[PDB]
Nucleic acid binder design. Structure first.
Lengths: 205, 52, 136, 217, 188
RNA sequence: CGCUCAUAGCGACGCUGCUUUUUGAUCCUUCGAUGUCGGCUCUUCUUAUCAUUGUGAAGCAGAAUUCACAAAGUGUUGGAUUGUUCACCCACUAACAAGGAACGUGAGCUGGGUUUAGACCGUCGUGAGACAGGUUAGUUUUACCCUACUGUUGUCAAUUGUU
RNA sequence: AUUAGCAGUUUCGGGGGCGUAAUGCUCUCAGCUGAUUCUCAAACUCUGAACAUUUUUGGUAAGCAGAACUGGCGAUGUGGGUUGAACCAAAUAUUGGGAUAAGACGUCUAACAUUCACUAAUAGAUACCACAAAAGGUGUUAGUUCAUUAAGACAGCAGGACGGUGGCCAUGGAAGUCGGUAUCCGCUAAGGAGUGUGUAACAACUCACCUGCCAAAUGGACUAGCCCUGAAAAUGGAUGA
């Protein structure tokens, strides 16, 4: 029916509306790749100053709280209808929350079909290819060229962003080699206010 | 490279549910035989793995 | 068993010794006779006696000899037969007597063969060929 | 049976024939045990009654019954313990089967043995059920309306004919429902022996409540 | 039964042109021309303009209803093939004898001499329209290409099934030519 | 049970069928007479497939074996003992699977047995005699009719006018 | 004829336990008694009605043997059931017309129209009567009940699947994952002291669990219709064709 099932949804409703008017400043972060080992270090620094509270697509159950506050949900930057989000709350440290969130990032190779971070460089050249792994390249339908004395498909630039799925072959290549394209964890989309947006601008530092 | 090949081989030969009242080779998600001798049935077991 | 021959098997050489055929042992062993029990490679019919031409392996028993061999079904080879047969040559050969030899199940004659050995037999079994005095 | 196909005595035919002073020679029944699990447990513990009723009118054999009960007894340890089961079976094999044997089974005769005095010697027993008779009751906790259901399913295969299975609306081995039983319990009108409620009357008990009311549940 | 079906629509890109006459379509694209018939009852199969082809079914049984979707899918496939062709990469493998494959585009045929040490030259003609080409990555693959998926897949299947020893244990050997990448399409 | 693992293969305690290749049950037909048994010979049919063909399972590595399906298209033996079907052995074989047709087949045979009269023995019986005990000797009649089949003429009495 | 616990005896018949020990005290345990409970009957009964079909005994059964009632057959055709001693309609002097009965009404074959589902089988198609079952089916048809869902369900695809900690047991080695017992807390949207693959054991992979994308229904356990499996036999072949 509604407000039922295994590990109830109604319970989560209480967290996502009643504790959404008990903090000064907020930051809408992106969690589409960070793990639990990486994330529990950002549930100590953030937990001490405020919290990380979101039931996930429970912003449409916030409309009772928007009677007084008038909060943007689809109106702010990123409509949140293509990517997962986890809202960061803070009241003690409103200045020292935007950068310590980015300090706990950990770099690693890409995955098969992942949404992926902002920056994703594919391995290429002498360092980014092995001589034994040319077979794989040959297998692919895309063209292979001899650049810098090494057989490679040649691409060392950004071809995908946040909310664009990486190719399988590319992912495989990344995994095989020791190339880590970018350091990622909880990445802020925008800074967020109570009933408004404080800064509609990305801050990865 | 070589393991990939092996897995491919397995895919079409070894990983298939193999019925019971029938011995028809089906497919890993099977819950029937598609044989009007078997009577479709719901006795599907996996096809066994290699042993020396 | 074995047979390893040659490369066909001949070029058949006529029924001559049905079963219950007594023949000469023609070999340095205790045996004088060889009563033919049956012939190897005889799929039946319905009232048809298994028969051995030449170079047929023949399960046999020694009717008359020394008693160390007797009362014992044993493998042998028909080495010449009185019943004539046509060869490739064109000519029909026949021999003075029906005769066999003693052998292993694989076709290994351990004695040396007395009398003519018949070319077909020689062609078939290598050991037999080796131990022949006369193949003609 | 072991001697014959049970399809010989599949259906109820002839008048009931029982171990008596007129039929003393009968062999002993295959089941001499109508027990399963903790029988000492109170009816107030186990509130769920899963039956098995024979959907057909038939002669359901002693052997068959035996087979059934052990199937349930081999679906006691794999799921739960013995302290969630109770069973009085509710179908004894009272009827006894006559078997007129013949000498020439492998031998021969020119109709010498025959039917010249055809009476059958007692050999075997059987329980004569109907289309709505209970052939296995399981009293149990409310945490097993799957496992005793599946025990009884197993039993069903041991028996001739189609076999319905039902979860009752009563406390097992008692006339009262769960809405009525509970009411009684609340009121103090209920009273327990050991595995059977007595229930306190008002017709017999006009003014003698000094024993019934003392031991109310 | 007899519920009244809705439409099933399939998009048409402006690269191709889809004809239809007597419940039997013909896609025409840059790559070539595929044709297919569909025979059913009250199956109105029409063109909206040159952007949507619609398949309908007035009062369908469940069986009847099911086939509509299939039809739609098949026409979609055709559309795909005639604008950007299907490519099936087949990898071949055995753990000792090197399996000798070589293509003949004149005959339009693959031939396989060795595979289990079988001295036969195991060959079969590829289906009409489709071709293979000897692509190398370490002497491991052959890549079939075509317009029609239906034909292409059949071709692949034929050389898969043939390439397999049919005596004793199936798990012990890896002998065969198997389809690895089938979802890929030739680049334009 | 199968080291593990209910169902690779088996499968208790139970239950449900089928077949008429067992023996009974019965007495419906036949007692003014349907020649009993086995064998030889010959044909056809059945599938509940032993082998061979194509397949699929397996505790299928290989070889070997076991399990199942489509399949009755083709095969499925020589012998010692016994009247024996049955039985048991020897030898071959790819295999030497099971069955039906008035328990296929006596104007087809044989007559070894059963199965008349002679006779011997054993046990029984006072005896005549008995024996579902053993032994030995003991008539196998008729097709030329009808159909069926094998072949052979001949009429398509317009073989389409005749040859 | 038979099943079960329970109460009061309980010291007793016997085992112990209880104060150093007792026909002294209480248990399981037998026996006695009481109130409940399961089932029970041709040869029990308080009570107690109204060849065929029905009643009915022997028999595993029979187209077997034997009874009761009624109706047939025999003694009897006719119409129907393809065919038929007994079934159904219905009784038989000789005819005509009429209208019916059972039963039929594609064609054989006298007789048709309209209309709603069901059957996807080589099925199925006139009771007696020429067969068929237990048990199976994500075949379809309808139905029952329960649960989930705009709090983002269902399906797919994607992300995560952590700390105490390799808990405590045991041991070449068992570190979530041969096996024994407890099975809690932190941090969380959420993550079993863990569902298998794997490893001397790990690692690695996988699942429960949670969530993104998409966008309206979805999941299940039963029920009973037809249909399929179950379903093998001998001349060629029988819904009569």
């Amino acid at each position: 029916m509604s407000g039922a099932g295994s590990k109830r949804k109604n319970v989560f409703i209480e967290k996502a509306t009643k504790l959404f008017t008990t903090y000064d400043k907020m930051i809408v972060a992106e969690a589409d790749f960070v793990g639990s080992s990486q994330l529990q270090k950002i549930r100590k620094s953030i937990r001490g100053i405020g919290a990380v509270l979101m039931g996930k697509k429970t912003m449409i159950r916030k409309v009772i709280r928007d009677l007084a506050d008038s909060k943007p949900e689809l109106d702010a930057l990123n409509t949140y209808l293509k990517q997962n989000t986890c809202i960061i709350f803070c009241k003690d440290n409103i200045a020292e929350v935007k950068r310590v969130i980015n300090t706990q990032r950990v770099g690693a190779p890409a995955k098969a079909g992942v949404f992926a971070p902002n920056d994703v460089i594919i391995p290429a050249g002498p360092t980014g290819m092995e001589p034994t792994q040319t077979s794989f390249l040959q297998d692919l339908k895309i063209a292979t060229k001899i650049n810098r004395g090494q057989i490679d498909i040649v691409n060392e630039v950004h071809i995908i962003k946040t909310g664009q799925k990486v190719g399988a072959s590319e992912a495989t290549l990344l995994q095989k080699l020791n190339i880590k394209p970018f350091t990622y964890g909880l990445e802020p989309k925008i800074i967020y206010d109570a009933g408004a947006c404080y800064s509609p601008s990305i801050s990865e530092e | 490279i070589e393991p990939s090949l092996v897995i491919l081989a397995r895919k079409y030969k070894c990983d298939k549910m193999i019925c019971r009242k029938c011995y028809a080779r089906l497919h890993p998600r099977a819950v029937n035989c598609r044989k009007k001798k078997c009577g479709h049935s719901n006795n599907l077991r996996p096809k066994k793995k290699l042993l020396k | 068993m074995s047979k390893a021959q040659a490369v066909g098997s001949n070029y058949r050489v006529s029924l001559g010794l049905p079963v219950g055929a007594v023949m000469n042992s023609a070999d340095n062993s205790g045996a004088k006779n060889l009563y033919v029990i049956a012939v190897k490679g005889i799929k039946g019919r319905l009232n048809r006696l298994p028969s051995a031409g030449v170079g047929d392996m023949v399960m046999a028993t020694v009717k008359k000899g020394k008693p160390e061999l007797r009362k014992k079904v044993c493998t042998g080879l028909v080495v010449r037969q009185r019943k004539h047969w046509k060869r490739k040559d064109g000519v029909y050969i026949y021999f003075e007597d029906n005769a066999g030899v003693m052998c292993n199940p694989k076709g290994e004659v351990k004695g040396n063969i007395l009398g003519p050995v018949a070319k077909e037999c020689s062609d078939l079994w290598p050991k037999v060929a080796t131990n022949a005095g006369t193949i003609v | 049976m072991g001697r014959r196909p049970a399809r010989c005595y599949r259906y109820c035919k002839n008048k009931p024939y029982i171990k008596s002073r007129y039929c003393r020679g009968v062999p002993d029944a295959k089941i001499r045990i109508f027990d399963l699990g903790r029988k000492k447990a109170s009816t107030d513990e186990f509130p769920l009654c899963v039956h098995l009723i024979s959907l057909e009118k038939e002669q359901l054999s002693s052997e068959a019954i035996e087979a059934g009960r052990i199937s349930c007894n081999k679906y006691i340890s794999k799921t739960g313990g013995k302290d969630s089961f109770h069973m009085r079976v509710r179908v004894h094999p009272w009827h006894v089967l006559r078997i007129n044997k013949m000498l020439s089974c492998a031998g021969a005769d020119r109709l010498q043995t025959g039917m010249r005095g055809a009476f059958g010697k007692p050999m075997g027993t059987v329980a004569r059920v109907n289309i709505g008779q209970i052939i296995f009751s399981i009293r149990t906790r409310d945490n097993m309306l799957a496992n005793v259901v599946e025990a009884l399913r197993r039993s069903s295969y041991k028996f001739p004919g189609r076999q319905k299975i039902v979860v009752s609306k009563k406390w097992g081995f008692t006339a009262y429902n769960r809405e009525a039983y509970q009411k009684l319990k609340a009121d103090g009108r209920l009273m327990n022996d050991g595995a059977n409620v007595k229930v306190i009357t008002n017709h017999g008990t006009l003014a003698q409540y000094a024993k019934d009311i003392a031991a109310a549940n | 039964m007899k519920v009244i079906n809705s439409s099933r629509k399939v998009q048409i890109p402006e690269n191709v042109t889809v004809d239809v006459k007597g419940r039997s379509v013909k896609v025409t694209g840059p790559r070539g021309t595929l044709s297919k018939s569909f025979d059913h009852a009250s199956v109105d199969i029409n063109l909206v303009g040159k952007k949507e082809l619609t398949v309908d079914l007035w009062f369908g049984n469940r069986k009847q209803i099911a086939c509509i979707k299939t039809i739609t899918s098949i026409i979609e496939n055709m559309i795909t093939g005639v604008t950007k062709g299907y490519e099936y990469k087949m990898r071949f493998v055995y753990a000792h004898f090197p399996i000798n494959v070589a293509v003949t585009d004149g005959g339009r045929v693959v031939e396989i001499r060795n595979f289990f040490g079988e001295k036969i030259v195991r060959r079969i003609e590829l289906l009409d329209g489709i071709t293979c080409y000897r692509n190398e990555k370490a002497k491991d693959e052959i890549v079939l290409t075509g317009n029609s998926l239906e034909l292409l897949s059949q071709s692949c299947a034929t050389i898969q099934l043939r390439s397999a020893i049919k005596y004793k244990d199936v798990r012990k050997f890896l002998d065969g030519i198997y389809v690895s990448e089938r979802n890929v399409l030739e680049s334009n």
